[model samples]
Target: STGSATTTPIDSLDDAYITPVQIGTPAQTLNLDFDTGSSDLWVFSSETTASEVDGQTIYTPSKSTTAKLLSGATWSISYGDGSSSSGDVYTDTVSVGGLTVTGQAVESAKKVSSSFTEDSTIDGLLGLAFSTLNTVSPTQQKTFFDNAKASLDSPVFTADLGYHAPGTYNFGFIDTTAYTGSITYTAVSTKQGFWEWTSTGYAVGSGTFKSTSIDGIADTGTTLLYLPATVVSAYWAQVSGAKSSSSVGGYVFPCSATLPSFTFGVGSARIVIPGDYIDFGPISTGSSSCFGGIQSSAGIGINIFGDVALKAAFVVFNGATTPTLGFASK
Candidate 1:
């Protein structure tokens, strides 16, 4: 960022949502989402299609001479959130923001049938968040940052979201001017190729922070923040009042009064989530005053962070550079 120009060329609209990034030439860059829960880079290919997916973006190389299909290697990804995708492998120019990196390994989900297609605006994800789950690796361990450590402009990367097109999440080569903070980091407890962390508690009415040992995956791919049963019901108690009917799905109350200060520490860098993020939209009760976060994902493995969480903190993926996540004010 400090040394190179940021903005690059947008090759095509692709699928109304997925924007194409010209990696270097016509052999490396592919369609990928800027994910936070995991650290890796992945893309959908011409082999993958709308029929194979419900709402996932599929990159059709036939549309452009730039996109190429990789031979021999096959690609597949399974998510803890009960989603999966599989396809052939391909290589082409993988470019983003005026920078292009060649000879990159990209997965082409040609035959995908995952539940993730419902709301994930993009076709595939290019994980830039804080998890160590690298889908693209020899040991399936070479995360984006892991690969980037040797090539990135600095020891950092940044994500910039689009205004109305909220799906526009950028990664790689962080510009120091992106955000301000005293960075601190912490190791994410993981197993089975997924990233996990601990939560102190959930908050609601009048500084009431309910104590609990909630474990969650900091996934940016998810739309709503998921929480445990007690935390979910408890949050509704403070947000909508006991009299207000309980609501389903991922909706929120705008009342900042009930929200409390939340923070996560990664070593010396302690990331604080602003109450404003908790200031989601109004609930179905027709109550615009009340505000809330936390959506329901059902069952155990209970919590996760959505865009609301990312907006409050400057998330860092240190997998390749370091095996820890750094959090701070963005």
Candidate 2:
């Protein structure tokens, strides 16, 4: 009726978080990136190109007696970063933590981008977004959460992403001990198949809050926080020696610069992101200029409250008929 799992950051920069998942009947455990940005439970498997296989674990459906090919079904997905994967589909017994879902659609990767091949830390991705975003062809499949929601004690899932530490993903129930302070709830617009919401406003360090409506998605798959150009510029202005460099690929500042914290409003509650989390390490090894975790979402069209923001608080993706999102300070 419930499930809980630990999600660990893949690197020092907290580029992505990975959680263990069991696929197939015998249960081949693979570390998958839990992405709230997309919908499609895909994995590196025996169907994947041999050259694309790195140190990542592969799921062999042949080893599972319960595996059944979803004949004529296929899937292809691409991210905002341009990386993509595509392959055939299979239905199998899938489990996350202790929660089990039989006949779960599992997309077996036959082709993967170079980025995925080079990253040995994650074997695949488990999408938590609405099923509307699923890339499966012929028939759209529900996400693992969607498929398991009815059997759960409650239709809800929570994310407690950490800063350089392990966090938790709980399905069906919220862990009261996981957070402090009362949760602030807000309406979620799943029109785009994302946990999209409008933040009341934001403040840089000790500055006054800006009473503006900033719309964005709470995406755990993305590595950094991306806001409007004005907000990003305002935050960077407070840091000495900060500059928006095209060559450096975004805002960069001196590694030794003193950084300020960022705070965003969720209804009446405000969650503060420590400055250290925004100081996204150096652009290159031994480089004195460091990249910023908060960048402008100008060209992207939509703002993103990624790991940089998610790590600051406990997030609840409530799966009610009329969905809502809850944020609580931890």
Best-matching candidate per TM-score: 2
In candidate 1, what residue range of length 10 has the lowest lDDT sum? 7-16
Candidates in order: C-alpha RMSD to true structure: 6.1, 0.6
CA-RMSD of model 1: 6.1
Residue 266, model 2, lDDT? 97
lDDT of 2 by residue, 146-188 (tens): 9999999999999999999999999999999999999999999
* Alpha-carbon lDDT of model 2: 0.95
Measured against the true structure, the TM-scores of the candidates, in listed sequence, are: 0.67, 0.99
In model 2, the clashing pairs are: none
Superposition error at 221 for model 2 (Å): 0.3
Weakest ten-residue segment in model 2 by summed lDDT: 9-18
Tell me the lDDT of model 1 at 317.
Answer: 48
Q: Model 1 TM-score?
A: 0.67
**What is the per-residue lDDT of model 1 for residues 126-196, given as tens digits with 9 covering 90 to 100?**
65444345454333434444444456555555443322233333344444565686655556665634456
Superposed by TM-score, candidate 1 places the C-alpha of residue 298 at a distance from the truth, in angstroms, of: 6.4
